[PDB]
Amino acid sequence: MEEGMNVLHDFGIQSTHYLQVNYQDSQDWFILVSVIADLRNAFYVLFPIWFHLQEAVGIKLLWVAVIGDWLNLVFKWILFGQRPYWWVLDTDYYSNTSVPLIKQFPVTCETGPGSPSGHAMGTAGVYYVMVTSTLSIFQGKRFRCLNVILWLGFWAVQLNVCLSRIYLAANFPHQVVAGVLSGIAVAETFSHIHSIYNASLKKYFLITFFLFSFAIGFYLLLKGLGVDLLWTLEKAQRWCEQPEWVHIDTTPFASLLKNLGTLFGLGLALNSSMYRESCKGKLSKWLPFRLSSIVASLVLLHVFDSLKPPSQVELVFYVLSFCKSAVVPLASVSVIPYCLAQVLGQ
Ligand SMILES: O=P(O)(O)OC[C@H]1O[C@H](O)[C@H](O)[C@@H](O)[C@@H]1O
């Protein structure tokens, strides 16, 4: 088996070297592509925009994003998998030959296993939902041209994300291909599910509790058994160039809490009391109201994102991240429309 994964690793290293050497003027473009491809933008930009227009799309988008980031974590733990920025300096494969010279970037110090890519998986899962929903909405409200344009844009986005994750290292081509396929599969699976709407308040809590308990118990069971699931945190603390390039917000534990928090926040916002009576006469039916709601949500969420929880004790950071993630869907669905209604309603 060892002589089989080495071929894939060497192919990835050679591809990264070729991209980095023969394309040097596209560094900033690839960094920008890798920056605006974070899932943070799927909770702070896409969801507020898509919730106030055909609100059935926003709930599906949030559910797909959360379940995709839980499945990516769980399959990242078991599949293991290296990243082409510590493997180059740690392997003993490049003996009898010169080791290739690879370059690191302020974003190439990721902590975590990388067998399914997570940027590609999330981007595919979200943009497939968006494109399919738009095609369904504008279906004969010349369609072939729109179909071709939207699918071309989707595939261009996926290709650019793959090239970005390969150029800056931190991932192998088979990893990004697997991530794209898994994201598309998850998007389709939730495209054929109709129970995520009008769910009770007990359902959301039971679901998030089951996910958290499964993750924590699985980790504890393997840790007691003898294996170490958190092994990439030690290999990223030696081979990263600058010790300031690693952050705690990219620790497998942080993402899980940040996803459970936003799921619970969406549940609370949907099953609250202000949402059920947001309209008070003539409201929630006019374009100015919804456009102003979108603008206010975007501006206030962008301002509120600046509040960085203190990172001195890990438990405090985890709980504050949970609460801060829970705030955004609750404050974007229940509070801003209520304030706008009570101000410009009479
Ligand atoms: O695609 P990757 O390079 O593995 O990055 C994807 C991962 O980035 C962060 O570190 C988070 O832990 C995850 O929420 C995300 O899935």
PDB file of N, CA and C and ligand atoms in Angstrom, residues 38-39 69 72-73 76 83 110-121 165 169-171 249-252 255 258-259, ligand 1:
ATOM      1  N   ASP A  38     -14.333  30.651   1.491  1.00  0.00           N
ATOM      2  CA  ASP A  38     -14.608  30.170   2.867  1.00  0.00           C
ATOM      3  C   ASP A  38     -16.113  30.049   3.051  1.00  0.00           C
ATOM      4  N   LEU A  39     -16.533  29.183   3.978  1.00  0.00           N
ATOM      5  CA  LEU A  39     -17.978  28.972   4.245  1.00  0.00           C
ATOM      6  C   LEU A  39     -18.508  30.157   5.064  1.00  0.00           C
ATOM      7  N   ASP A  69     -20.210  20.221   6.141  1.00  0.00           N
ATOM      8  CA  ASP A  69     -19.053  20.451   7.052  1.00  0.00           C
ATOM      9  C   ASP A  69     -19.008  19.431   8.196  1.00  0.00           C
ATOM     10  N   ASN A  72     -17.673  16.240   6.263  1.00  0.00           N
ATOM     11  CA  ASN A  72     -16.257  16.429   5.848  1.00  0.00           C
ATOM     12  C   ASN A  72     -15.375  16.200   7.056  1.00  0.00           C
ATOM     13  N   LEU A  73     -15.790  16.686   8.218  1.00  0.00           N
ATOM     14  CA  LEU A  73     -14.997  16.438   9.420  1.00  0.00           C
ATOM     15  C   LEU A  73     -14.920  14.946   9.732  1.00  0.00           C
ATOM     16  N   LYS A  76     -12.842  13.157   7.319  1.00  0.00           N
ATOM     17  CA  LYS A  76     -11.448  13.561   7.432  1.00  0.00           C
ATOM     18  C   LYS A  76     -10.758  12.832   8.573  1.00  0.00           C
ATOM     19  N   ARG A  83      -0.870  16.462   3.643  1.00  0.00           N
ATOM     20  CA  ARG A  83      -1.007  17.744   2.908  1.00  0.00           C
ATOM     21  C   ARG A  83       0.356  18.101   2.332  1.00  0.00           C
ATOM     22  N   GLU A 110      -2.406  24.914   7.105  1.00  0.00           N
ATOM     23  CA  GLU A 110      -3.679  24.317   7.591  1.00  0.00           C
ATOM     24  C   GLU A 110      -3.450  23.152   8.559  1.00  0.00           C
ATOM     25  N   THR A 111      -4.232  23.106   9.627  1.00  0.00           N
ATOM     26  CA  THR A 111      -4.147  22.068  10.651  1.00  0.00           C
ATOM     27  C   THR A 111      -5.359  21.157  10.493  1.00  0.00           C
ATOM     28  N   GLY A 112      -5.113  19.910  10.104  1.00  0.00           N
ATOM     29  CA  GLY A 112      -6.172  18.943   9.938  1.00  0.00           C
ATOM     30  C   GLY A 112      -5.898  17.981   8.801  1.00  0.00           C
ATOM     31  N   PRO A 113      -6.431  16.764   8.901  1.00  0.00           N
ATOM     32  CA  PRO A 113      -6.311  15.819   7.788  1.00  0.00           C
ATOM     33  C   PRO A 113      -7.006  16.372   6.556  1.00  0.00           C
ATOM     34  N   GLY A 114      -6.502  15.998   5.387  1.00  0.00           N
ATOM     35  CA  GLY A 114      -7.024  16.586   4.172  1.00  0.00           C
ATOM     36  C   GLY A 114      -7.395  15.623   3.067  1.00  0.00           C
ATOM     37  N   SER A 115      -7.963  14.457   3.400  1.00  0.00           N
ATOM     38  CA  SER A 115      -8.252  13.480   2.353  1.00  0.00           C
ATOM     39  C   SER A 115      -9.430  13.902   1.481  1.00  0.00           C
ATOM     40  N   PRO A 116     -10.594  14.298   2.022  1.00  0.00           N
ATOM     41  CA  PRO A 116     -11.544  15.051   1.196  1.00  0.00           C
ATOM     42  C   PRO A 116     -11.336  16.549   1.360  1.00  0.00           C
ATOM     43  N   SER A 117     -11.189  17.283   0.259  1.00  0.00           N
ATOM     44  CA  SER A 117     -10.999  18.722   0.360  1.00  0.00           C
ATOM     45  C   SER A 117     -12.254  19.381   0.919  1.00  0.00           C
ATOM     46  N   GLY A 118     -12.115  20.440   1.694  1.00  0.00           N
ATOM     47  CA  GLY A 118     -13.280  21.063   2.331  1.00  0.00           C
ATOM     48  C   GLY A 118     -13.703  22.339   1.668  1.00  0.00           C
ATOM     49  N   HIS A 119     -12.785  23.078   1.071  1.00  0.00           N
ATOM     50  CA  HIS A 119     -13.191  24.236   0.283  1.00  0.00           C
ATOM     51  C   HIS A 119     -13.993  23.805  -0.938  1.00  0.00           C
ATOM     52  N   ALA A 120     -13.474  22.826  -1.684  1.00  0.00           N
ATOM     53  CA  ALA A 120     -14.165  22.350  -2.876  1.00  0.00           C
ATOM     54  C   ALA A 120     -15.507  21.727  -2.526  1.00  0.00           C
ATOM     55  N   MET A 121     -15.548  20.921  -1.462  1.00  0.00           N
ATOM     56  CA  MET A 121     -16.791  20.271  -1.063  1.00  0.00           C
ATOM     57  C   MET A 121     -17.858  21.298  -0.707  1.00  0.00           C
ATOM     58  N   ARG A 165      -6.514  25.479  -4.607  1.00  0.00           N
ATOM     59  CA  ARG A 165      -6.096  24.568  -3.547  1.00  0.00           C
ATOM     60  C   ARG A 165      -4.872  23.750  -3.933  1.00  0.00           C
ATOM     61  N   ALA A 169      -0.487  24.686  -2.353  1.00  0.00           N
ATOM     62  CA  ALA A 169      -0.286  23.435  -1.631  1.00  0.00           C
ATOM     63  C   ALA A 169      -1.465  23.158  -0.709  1.00  0.00           C
ATOM     64  N   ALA A 170      -1.235  22.371   0.343  1.00  0.00           N
ATOM     65  CA  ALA A 170      -2.234  22.024   1.353  1.00  0.00           C
ATOM     66  C   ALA A 170      -3.274  21.031   0.844  1.00  0.00           C
ATOM     67  N   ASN A 171      -3.225  20.669  -0.437  1.00  0.00           N
ATOM     68  CA  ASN A 171      -4.118  19.644  -0.966  1.00  0.00           C
ATOM     69  C   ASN A 171      -3.515  19.044  -2.228  1.00  0.00           C
ATOM     70  N   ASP A 249      -8.867  28.951  15.126  1.00  0.00           N
ATOM     71  CA  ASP A 249     -10.189  28.891  14.514  1.00  0.00           C
ATOM     72  C   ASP A 249     -10.274  27.881  13.374  1.00  0.00           C
ATOM     73  N   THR A 250      -9.139  27.272  13.019  1.00  0.00           N
ATOM     74  CA  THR A 250      -9.130  26.227  11.968  1.00  0.00           C
ATOM     75  C   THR A 250      -8.862  24.885  12.628  1.00  0.00           C
ATOM     76  N   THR A 251      -9.115  24.775  13.936  1.00  0.00           N
ATOM     77  CA  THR A 251      -8.956  23.490  14.658  1.00  0.00           C
ATOM     78  C   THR A 251     -10.219  22.667  14.497  1.00  0.00           C
ATOM     79  N   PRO A 252     -10.139  21.381  14.085  1.00  0.00           N
ATOM     80  CA  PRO A 252     -11.338  20.566  13.841  1.00  0.00           C
ATOM     81  C   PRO A 252     -12.455  20.800  14.850  1.00  0.00           C
ATOM     82  N   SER A 255     -14.602  24.212  14.105  1.00  0.00           N
ATOM     83  CA  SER A 255     -15.568  24.172  13.011  1.00  0.00           C
ATOM     84  C   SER A 255     -16.843  23.447  13.427  1.00  0.00           C
ATOM     85  N   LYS A 258     -18.864  25.748  15.562  1.00  0.00           N
ATOM     86  CA  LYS A 258     -19.395  26.834  14.744  1.00  0.00           C
ATOM     87  C   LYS A 258     -20.510  26.382  13.810  1.00  0.00           C
ATOM     88  N   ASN A 259     -20.575  25.089  13.485  1.00  0.00           N
ATOM     89  CA  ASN A 259     -21.680  24.588  12.669  1.00  0.00           C
ATOM     90  C   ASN A 259     -22.893  24.230  13.524  1.00  0.00           C
TER      91      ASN A 259
HETATM   92  O1  LIG B   1     -10.102  22.135   1.961  1.00  0.00           O
HETATM   93  P1  LIG B   1      -9.242  22.268   3.161  1.00  0.00           P
HETATM   94  O2  LIG B   1      -7.880  22.708   2.770  1.00  0.00           O
HETATM   95  O3  LIG B   1      -9.102  20.954   3.845  1.00  0.00           O
HETATM   96  O4  LIG B   1      -9.948  23.331   4.173  1.00  0.00           O
HETATM   97  C1  LIG B   1     -11.265  23.076   4.544  1.00  0.00           C
HETATM   98  C2  LIG B   1     -11.409  23.250   6.042  1.00  0.00           C
HETATM   99  O5  LIG B   1     -10.800  24.512   6.385  1.00  0.00           O
HETATM  100  C3  LIG B   1     -10.873  24.789   7.809  1.00  0.00           C
HETATM  101  O6  LIG B   1      -9.621  24.481   8.348  1.00  0.00           O
HETATM  102  C4  LIG B   1     -11.964  24.054   8.593  1.00  0.00           C
HETATM  103  O7  LIG B   1     -11.424  23.156   9.514  1.00  0.00           O
HETATM  104  C5  LIG B   1     -13.039  23.384   7.864  1.00  0.00           C
HETATM  105  O8  LIG B   1     -14.254  23.997   8.175  1.00  0.00           O
HETATM  106  C6  LIG B   1     -12.877  23.298   6.419  1.00  0.00           C
HETATM  107  O9  LIG B   1     -13.539  22.153   5.977  1.00  0.00           O
END
